[PDB]
């Protein structure tokens, strides 16, 4: 297993380390519930240095990305603007979900997950080649996500004056380089905050300063509860190469217009959308218990006919005080379902695939 440059900082902060996709990472630092509460109510931070940052440069960068991705980077017209997009195979299945930043006409950046690093890099370098793109894998950078209603103010205590000037009033989904800090208003929690990427040799001391600024260290346990409440997908669970983005609540990130932009998978996706697909929904179990991954989700239709879907991610929501789950299900589901939890058929409410907006329950 490999470790980030923060491994020692995590131990001084009391991390319980686990192996995560070949990375030793903190599962929590004492209490994953408290960690979740810190992000919802104040500031918490996560070591995201196992993500890979890819810089792409060259005159055909935009053109390349318009073909590679199912969202349309032509929508990025202001310097530093980011979007979320799927990156599909030829069959329209999801290879990854990623974020991409536009800096100049000839300079974009992708951030990809740890678990999909090698597959994504091969797919990208395979497809970029005929476009003549200079592709830089930035393993020289670490990254920290600082999240919560006080996260931006706490982090900005560490910024110099030029860095504060650069991010003043910055809106969501922008990133800007300001000295050795790349500061972006992105995250995986439902809350405001930054993800800050910086050189590996600077990351330990920056983490230390953030702790001292009153930002709580938060591990993978809270990262799951927060992202799931916020209705955000985890690759491998909500989607993978066998799953259409239309069946993983990624429909909103497909930029169908302009019609004349072909992208990898678009043909297959148009065919999928015409045949219709399953859909990712939210489940809430208010009865005692916890929904778990890969459990069957069953409902009986208008006619007496049974249909079955599956939980893609389940957890206990500390903000709701109930278990929640995301689940991929046949079209036709109504307002309730049943999930089989160890020999017993638990009723659940079926909702939109999001549970918390702005620290508040969405029902």
């Amino acid at each position: 297993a490999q470790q980030t440059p923060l491994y020692e900082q995590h131990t001084l902060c009391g991390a319980r380390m686990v192996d995560f996709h070949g990375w030793m990472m903190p599962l929590h630092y004492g209490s994953q519930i408290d960690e979740h509460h810190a992000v919802r109510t104040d500031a918490g931070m996560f070591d995201v240095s196992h993500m890979t940052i890819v810089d792409l440069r060259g005159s055909r960068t935009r053109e390349f990305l318009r073909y590679l991705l199912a969202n349309d980077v032509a929508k990025l017209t202001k310097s530093g603007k980011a979007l979320y997009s799927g990156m599909l195979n030829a069959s329209g299945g999801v290879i990854d979900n990623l974020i991409v930043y536009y800096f100049t006409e000839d300079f974009f950046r992708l951030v990809v997950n740890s678990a999909t690093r090698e597959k994504d890099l091969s797919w990208i370098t395979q497809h970029a080649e005929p476009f003549g793109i200079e592709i830089t894998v930035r393993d020289d950078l670490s990254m920290i996500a600082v999240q919560g209603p006080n996260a931006q103010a706490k982090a900005a205590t560490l910024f110099n004056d030029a860095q504060r000037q650069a991010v003043e009033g910055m809106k969501p989904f922008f990133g800007v380089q300001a000295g050795d800090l790349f500061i972006a208003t992105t995250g995986y929690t439902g809350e405001a905050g930054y993800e800050i990427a910086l050189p590996n040799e600077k990351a330990a001391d920056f983490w230390r300063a953030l702790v001292e600024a009153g930002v709580k260290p938060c591990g993978l346990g809270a990262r799951d509860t927060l992202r799931l409440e916020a209705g955000m997908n985890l690759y491998g669970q909500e989607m993978d190469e066998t799953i259409s983005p239309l069946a993983a609540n990624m429909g909103w990130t497909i930029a169908w217009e302009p019609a004349d932009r072909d992208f990898i998978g678009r043909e297959a996706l148009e065919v999928q959308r015409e045949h219709g697909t399953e859909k990712l929904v939210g489940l809430v179990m208010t009865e005692k218990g916890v929904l778990r991954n890969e459990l069957p989700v069953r409902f009986t239709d208008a006619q007496g006919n049974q249909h079955e879907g599956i939980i893609t991610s389940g957890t206990f929501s500390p903000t709701l005080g109930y278990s929640i789950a995301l689940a991929r299900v046949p079209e036709g589901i109504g307002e309730t379902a049943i999930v089989q939890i160890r020999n017993r058929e638990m009723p659940v409410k079926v909702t939109k695939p999001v549970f918390v907006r702005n620290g508040k329950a969405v029902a």
């Binding site: 209490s31 994953q32 519930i33 346990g221 218990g289 916890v290 206990f316 160890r342």
Partner: protein, 126 residues
């Protein structure tokens, strides 16, 4: 972390003998550390007869359901109903408010085979 005066089990539970001869049972600091934050506990029925090793309660964390075993044979005489409302007491007070159930032990030979504080410290030491 290991109160001097309690008796201990290999399944990482403690037992406190009460004035009336019954035993209060919980999980140890070590055990709760490994479980992580508790979000639900499923308690046995008051009056249930258990044998040592029966899975008779369930601790549920955000990550996993985890079985709790009877450390000795006997009858459940009480369970900790505060845990329905405050399951996190198992984490913050594993020897105090986080007690799980109370048992009337039916077998003295089991009791004589439980670990003292020192012999538990050594089971961790390992």
């Amino acid at each position: 972390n290991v109160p001097a005066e309690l008796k201990y089990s290999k399944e990482h539970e403690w037992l406190r003998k009460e004035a009336d001869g019954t035993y209060t049972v919980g999980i140890t600091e070590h055990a709760q550390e490994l479980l992580g934050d508790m979000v639900f506990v499923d308690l046995p029925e008051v009056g249930a007869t258990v044998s040592a090793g029966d899975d008779c309660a369930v601790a549920e964390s955000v990550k996993a359901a985890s079985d709790i075993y009877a450390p000795v044979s006997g009858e459940i005489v009480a369970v900790n109903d505060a845990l329905s409302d405050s399951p996190e007491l198992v984490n913050s007070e594993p020897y105090a408010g986080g007690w799980i159930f109370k048992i009337k032990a039916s077998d003295e030979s089991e009791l004589e085979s439980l670990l003292d504080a020192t012999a538990y410290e050594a089971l961790l030491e390992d």
